[PDB]
Design a binder for this molecule. Structure first.
Ligand code: ANP
Ligand code: MG
Length: 551
């Protein structure tokens, strides 16, 4: 995720002529400006502007600690910031930024090599760290991209299999001719000159050596000149672009609680039935003998009582959460519940609480995954200082991804609220209580008005859920109740934009509250939109208390 991908004046990987072109068409007015990618430095941009009808191009280097600055200028926490600052203070520039050269309608930034490099490295960090695949992997990427990128830049080259901490030119030469003499086979070693390294590669059965040089900035360099923040990136980039090399890198000559928790560090990120064998025998109805129901309760709600337990599986014992439906069948509606549970037993997403199965004994029991973190709204109460706006944006994201999935499968969650989003940890939220057939504050009108439950109705309560989240647990439509809102709503009257909730996110939960359920968007759009916002927030520096902040 590029931090400057939301800014409508950012054009991605384009040349100078292209930039200068767009700038013509827009007037040439003094203070007109755009931002684009820098082709020869990883993470950098180029600030281009028009002063006295002449173009000015300012390279913006991405420093090591994450800050961005024009050479010899002030450092910023990011592009957005950088461009707001120079809008009200030229500070060295010819004039102050004035009119963004907003991108024309329908265009989006043009993907560059670094983008592919970034998205690719990400995909492989996860793939290898958590041996994840299928949507499982697609889903851990979408939500955790931002965090991975940060882990990537902190991953020491010493750790990599292609780095050899104490080889000399000849030793290097020696080793390489020792194994398979394929083209592209390579290693990297530390030079005498501190902060210098060598890239030894095999081509046409000959070892070639390239010097890697570091900056006063601390960046890393191919004598070709392209600049990277770490060796791993450099190396990973040279398997793609052969610039300045006899040949590109291929195979690697081989070598010999956490601060910030991730969603896939958990046991519940992936379905219990993903062990092929465990999957083979996936009964909707569970035996009561393989169930251990604790006497003490996790909580209690309108629907029933929730008790922690543990379930015996073919090869493992899993922590489960049991909900005891307060209400049983009455009439052979029993199956109809069965019919449903059958549909829920299918839904598989890392961001929803999964149905392990059901079990009937003393009571009808809903056996589900263990998200013992307690619900969203409570978790956020009075934690405005402790839990940054980005970390909330991240949990709202995960919820969107769950509803996205649920939408996909033509499944309506009807009881969507903060109270129905349960944290596994501070960065991992799961949606729950989806098929359970004042709590009418979340319901879009047409549910109340016509009992019409669509995913478009869910889209409403999401906007409601967003409000609760972005205002740290505060009740919604406090000052009201029942028809009080029904009327309050009928008249284009909406909830307020909680303090310090960005414009985009409000404008979002707002579109969620468009009376005509048709004119309202679908989750596909929401998660899409929710993503950009989240991403721009996360790519920055991190707020809050704890120990994950020291990292
Ligand atoms: N799978 C679970 N894992 C751990 N705790 C849970 C789980 N499901 C529910 N709980 C607990 O029970 C509380 C919520 O009660 P629940 O029975 O889910 O109904 P509710 O959110 O209060 N209202 P409603 O779903 O609208 O009837 C939460 O605060 C949780 O602590
Ligand atoms: Mg609940």
């Amino acid at each position: 995720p590029d931090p400057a991908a939301h800014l409508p004046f950012f054009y991605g990987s384009i040349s100078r002529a292209e930039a200068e072109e767009h700038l013509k068409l827009a007037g040439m007015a003094d203070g007109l400006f755009l931002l684009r990618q820098c082709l020869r430095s990883l993470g950098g941009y180029v600030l281009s502007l028009v002063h006295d009808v002449r173009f000015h191009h300012f390279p913006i280097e991405r420093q090591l600690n994450g800050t961005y600055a024009i050479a010899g200028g002030k450092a910023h926490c990011g592009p957005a910031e950088l461009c707001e600052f120079y809008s009200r203070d030229p500070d060295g520039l010819p004039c102050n930024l004035r009119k963004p050269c907003n991108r024309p309608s329908g265009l989006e930034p043009q993907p560059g090599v670094f983008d592919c490099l970034r998205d690719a490295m990400v995909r492989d960090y996860v793939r290898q760290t958590w041996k994840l695949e299928g949507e499982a992997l697609e889903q851990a990427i979408i939500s955790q991209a931002p965090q991975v990128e940060k882990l990537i830049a902190t991953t020491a080259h010493e750790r990599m299999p292609w780095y050899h901490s104490s080889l000399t030119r000849e030793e290097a030469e020696r080793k390489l001719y020792s194994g398979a003499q394929t083209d592209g086979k390579f290693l990297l070693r530390p030079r005498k000159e501190q902060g210098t390294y060598a890239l030894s590669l095999i081509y046409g059965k000959t070892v070639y050596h390239y010097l890697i040089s570091q900056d006063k900035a601390g960046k890393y360099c191919i004598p070709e000149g392209t600049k990277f923040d770490t060796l791993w990136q450099l190396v990973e980039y040279l398997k793609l672009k052969a610039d300045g090399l006899i040949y590109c890198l291929k195979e690697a000559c081989p070598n010999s609680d956490k601060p910030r928790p991730m969603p896939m560090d958990t046991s519940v990120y992936e379905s219990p039935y993903s062990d092929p064998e465990e999957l083979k025998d996936k009964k909707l109805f569970l035996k009561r003998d393989n169930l251990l129901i604790a006497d003490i309760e996790l909580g209690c709600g309108n629907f029933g009582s929730v008790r922690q337990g543990v379930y015996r599986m073919r090869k493992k014992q899993i922590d489960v959460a049991i909900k005891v439906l307060k209400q049983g069948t009455e009439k052979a509606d029993t199956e109809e519940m069965m019919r449903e549970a059958q549909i829920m037993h299918q839904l598989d997403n890392p961001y929803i609480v999964r149905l392990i199965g059901v079990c009937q004994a003393e009571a009808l029991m809903l056996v589900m995954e263990m998200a013992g973190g307690g619900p969203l709204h409570k978790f956020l109460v009075g934690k405005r200082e402790e839990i940054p706006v980005s970390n909330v944006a991240e949990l709202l994201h995960q919820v969107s991804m769950g509803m996205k999935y649920l939408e996909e499968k033509n499944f309506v969650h009807r009881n969507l609220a903060a109270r129905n989003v349960l944290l596994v940890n501070r960065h991992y939220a799961k949606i729950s209580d989806f098929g359970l057939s004042w709590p009418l504050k979340w319901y879009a009108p047409e549910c109340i008005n016509f009992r019409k439950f669509s995913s478009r109705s869910d889209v409403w309560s999401y906007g409601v859920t967003m409000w609760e989240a972005l205002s740290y647990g505060q009740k919604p439509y406090k000052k009201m109740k029942g028809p009080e809102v029904m009327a309050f709503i009928e008249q284009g009257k909406r909830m307020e934009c909680p303090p310090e909730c960005p414009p985009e996110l409000y404008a979002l939960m707002s579109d969620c509250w468009i009376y005509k359920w048709e004119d309202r968007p679908d989750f596909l759009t929401v998660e899409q939109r929710m993503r950009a916002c989240y991403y721009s927030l996360a790519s920055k520096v991190e707020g809050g208390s704890g120990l994950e902040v020291l990292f």
